[PDB]
Structure formats: C-alpha cells, structure tokens
Structure 1
Amino acid sequence: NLVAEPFAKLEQDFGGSIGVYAMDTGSGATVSYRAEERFPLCSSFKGFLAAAVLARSQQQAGLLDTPIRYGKNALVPWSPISEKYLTTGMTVAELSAAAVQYSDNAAANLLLKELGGPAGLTAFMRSIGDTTFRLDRWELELNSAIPGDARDTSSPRAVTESLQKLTLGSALAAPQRQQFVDWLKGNTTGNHRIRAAVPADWAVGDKTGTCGVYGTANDYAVVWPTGRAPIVLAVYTRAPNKDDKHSEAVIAAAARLALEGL
C-alpha cells in the first residue's frame, strides 16, 4: 500500500498509531489509514454531543433558548466558560458553543445530562447509522485512554461518516445543521491541528480532543476548499505507554498527507 507508507513512517517516528480517514464529498475519493481501528474520543465527543442537542431541539420548542441556572457542583476542571458565567447561567445554545469551541467540561456534562447521559448520546449516534461510536463515561473519567479499552472510542472512518451526515447531509434539519457548522467554524482549540494543514483561504470547522496519556489526541473537521466540494476528515492518535506524549504536529502532518492524497 504505497499511499499508506508516509502514514506508517509518521506513526513510527511518533512512537504509536495514527488513524486517518478523509472523504472528498464531490468525487467520493478517500484516504484511509487504520481508518476502522478504535481510538479514544477524548473531548472530540463534544461535537457529536452538540449535534445530538440540536436534534433534540427540533422537537422541544425553545430548548436551545432555555437558560440553565447551574450551581458550582456542576463545575469540573477545565470549564473556563462555565465558571465565567456561573453567576449568570447559560442557555443550552451557549453551553453547546462552550463545549464545542472551548472544550468546556462542565458545559459538556450539563448537556449530557439533558440527553440521558453517555447512553443517550450513543443512542443518538446509532439513530444516524453510526454502529462504532460509544460513549460510556462523563468528563473527566472518559479520558483514561487505556490501550485495548473500547469505552469512549470510535474510529476515524465512523467519525468522518457521522460528521458528513450532520454537517452536510440531512441528519439534522437545515437550521440545526447550520448552527452545528457555525459552532465548529468558531472553534478556538484547533489552530495547531487540521487547521495548520489547510491553506489560509479555506474555511474550516473542527473539534479537538486530548486525553494526553498514552499519546492520545485527535481532531476532526469539515474543510471547504476554494472552488471545490467540501472535505470531511478525522485524525486520531494513540501510543502504548501511559507517559507517551501526544503531538499536535503529527496530527497536522497526517492531515497534510490526507489532503495531498485526495
């Protein structure tokens, strides 16, 4: 597989495993490397969480506009937006934007509670035809990333296929698809990952994840190249030792190879 050789060299130099899937939504061309292997989702589950909340909001009039007046016992580490608005509250739309664009942990757990927990989000992903995705735990326990543990994992391929259905296809009603795309476009946490592989004039929406242990981190994106149909892609990493470091540079490098191979 000569297409795969640069990815094998990249993951060997990194000291672990890289999983990549990219789809050109115009031509149907793909790039695939360990694309059906499981990797931990880490905070990347929060994009799909936001999409699941948008789907619920189609049926529950005014859900996205509802103010949530959470207390301090809803807060957990790395919740910078939830802490800032503790004395104000946040609407469900605001919580969703915080979870997607700042990876806010408390906001994500509040929205999981709205959906019926990790099982609720898994059920939503099954409803759009994703058989691989599983969320089992809440923030912060879902980040353990233990090698060979299937909890809180998906595959690059299933992430890309589900992202395409939600951002570009008909899984959400159009005004909800558009809100999901705008949240991903406004992400603040991904400037050194897929965004670093994209020409500056191309629009991007992405969601990152970082477990940190076991070299585990990831990004997935929709990318709108000038004059072309959009690309959807996912890059996930892991490594065998608890102390192995993740690399944003390796994610960006894998994304560059994926765009080059399409």
Structure 2
Amino acid sequence: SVQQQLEALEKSSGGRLGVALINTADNSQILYRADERFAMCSTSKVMAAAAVLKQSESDKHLLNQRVEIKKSDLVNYNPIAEKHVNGTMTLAELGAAALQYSDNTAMNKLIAHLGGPDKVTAFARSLGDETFRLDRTEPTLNTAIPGDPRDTTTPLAMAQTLKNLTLGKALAETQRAQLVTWLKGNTTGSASIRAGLPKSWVVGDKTGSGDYGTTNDIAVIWPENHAPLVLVTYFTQPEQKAENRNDILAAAAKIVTHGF
C-alpha cells in the first residue's frame, strides 16, 4: 500500500521519485526506485566531509589546519566562505559550512585538499559503496542531466552508506559523532524531510537540489522511543528549468514513516 502512495505522488509531480528507508530496529527496508541513479547534487557534500574525518583518525592535527580563502576561489554559492575572504578557515570549519549551509567554496576546498573528485569516490569504495561516483566539483556537479551517470548514486547505496557513516563502522566514534553533530545542525532541511515528520523527532540531514528540478534530502532520524531510521529521498524532473520540489520530499517522508 505504501507502494501505491509513492507511485501516486510521483505521477502527479510529473517527475521520477526515489526513496530508500532503512529501519535499523530490524534492518527492514522500504524501497522505491532505490536501484536507479539520481544526481546527488549537494548531498554529495556528506562524502567529502567524512573523507576528511576518516583522515583525522590518523592525523589528529588535520582538522585544525587552516585554509586560505580567496576571491578567485569563490564559486556561485558561498554563504560562509565569502565572509572569510582574505582570512582562513580550518578544515573542520569547511566541513561544517558545506553541510549545514551548503557552501560550495567549502565543498571545493575539501575536494582539492583530497586530490580531486576521484579520491572521494575511492573513499566511498573503501566503505563498501560501489555505486557512488563524484566526477566534478562545484557548481557543475549539479547539472543533473537525465541519463548522465556523473556525480550520481542510488537511493539505497546512499541509505546504506549514510547509515554506516552515522550509525555504523565507517568512522571511528569521535569522527562519527562529529559527522552527526554537523548533520543535525543543518540549516537547509526545514521544508524537506523534516516537514513530513513529527516536530519532536530529531534529525540531522543534508539537502541537494540542482537543475532539472532535482530535489534531494538524506537524513538520519531519531524517533523518541524507537531505533533510528535512515531515509533517502531523491527526486528529479524532465524539464531543465523545473522548479525544485521540497514539498514532495516532505510528502514522501510522511508517507513512508507513517507507521512509527
């Protein structure tokens, strides 16, 4: 029956909906187009920060290393990075900026630091993720052209991986709780998955929108009396200049967690 509400939603939205919920209590799943590739957009920014956290395990000084922010670094959306022009920003500061405020300059600084988009993919691989693939930097990794496999993953590959990063064995404890603290403090997920859930529940998430009306959100949920839920809602549309649809993610979240 849940299959019927998500198929109705999708059809009326005139788009293509993906969803991958993993109820950790019993590891049961609720999958809709979960093995189909969607353009991650700014949800990919979670993998770039966790790859820098995984580093700090072996390098205790790493996160405090400062990073010079200049004008010619500034890409299109730099809500935090721009304040620090002619200043610095440590690596922990750029991970928090990329996730909580979705700073693109910050996302680009982390990548360069690693060595390029292909390193962040190699990291995904080391977590057991064979689907994820970051090809480009900001802002071009959001074109979200249909069929294009660049910078795409699947809703289930992203649900399984997010679970391991925030509730699993991907990161040492210290780094896991820092990734989780970062996600919770997010400032952009208001209208998305969070909307479709009870106000009392706790949520750390990262959105991702792009062209072709691409609207994504990946969130770890902590019910008040239940084990955590991992929810990945990917949505995209056929028209390049299609409006983004967060209300579709709020709806889908409601539909799938209608039972907890």
User: What TM-score range do you get, normalising by the shorter chain?
Assistant: over 0.9
List gaps (5 residues or longer) in structure 2. Answer: none
The answer to whether structure 1 residue 217 and structure 2 residue 215 are counterparts is yes
Provide Cα deviations, 1:160-215, integer angstroms capped at 9, x if missing partner.
1000000001110000000000000000011000111121111100000010x212
Q: Once the 2 structures are TM-superposed, how far is the Cα of residue 88 of structure 1 from its aligned partner?
A: 2.6
RMSD: 1.1
Whether contact under 8 Å (1:3, 1:261) holds in the other structure is no
Residues 170-209 of structure 1: pairs in structure 2 closer than 5 A? 170-209=169-208
Distance (whole Å) between structure 2 residues aligned to residue 104 and residue 93 of structure 1:
13
SS of residue matched to 1:246: coil
Paired letter, 1:259 = T
Distance (whole Å) between structure 1 residues aligned to residue 140 and residue 224 of structure 2:
40
SS of residue matched to 1:162: helix
Bigger shift: residues 154-163 or 56-65: 56-65
SS of residue matched to 1:67: coil
Q: In the alignment, which residue of structure 2 is the partner of 1:17?
A: 16
The answer to whether structure 1 residue 228 and structure 2 residue 218 are counterparts is no
Residues 39-58 of structure 1: pairs in structure 2 closer than 5 A? 39-58=38-57
Structure 2 length-normalised TM: 0.97
Provide Cα deviations, 1:81-122, integer angstroms capped at 9, x if missing partner.
000122331110001000000000000000001111110100
Paired letter, 1:255 = A
Equivalences, count: 260
Q: In the alignment, which residue of structure 2 is the partner of 1:163?
A: 162
SS of residue matched to 2:186: coil
Q: Once the 2 structures are TM-superposed, how far is the Cα of residue 243 of structure 1 from its aligned partner?
A: 2.5
Distance (whole Å) between structure 2 residues aligned to residue 35 and residue 124 of structure 1:
21
Distance (whole Å) between structure 2 residues aligned to residue 51 and residue 197 of structure 1:
27
Paired letter, 2:244 = H
SS of residue matched to 2:129: coil
Which of 236, 255, 258 is the matching residue for 2:253?
255
SS of residue matched to 1:241: coil
The answer to whether structure 1 residue 131 and structure 2 residue 108 are counterparts is no
Q: Once the 2 structures are TM-superposed, how far is the Cα of residue 70 of structure 1 from its aligned partner?
A: 2.4
Q: Once the 2 structures are TM-superposed, how far is the Cα of residue 258 of structure 1 from its aligned partner?
A: 1.4
Distance (whole Å) between structure 1 residues aligned to residue 128 and residue 259 of structure 2:
27
Structure 1 length-normalised TM: 0.97
Whether contact under 8 Å (1:31, 1:261) holds in the other structure is no
Q: In the alignment, which residue of structure 2 is the partner of 1:31?
A: 30
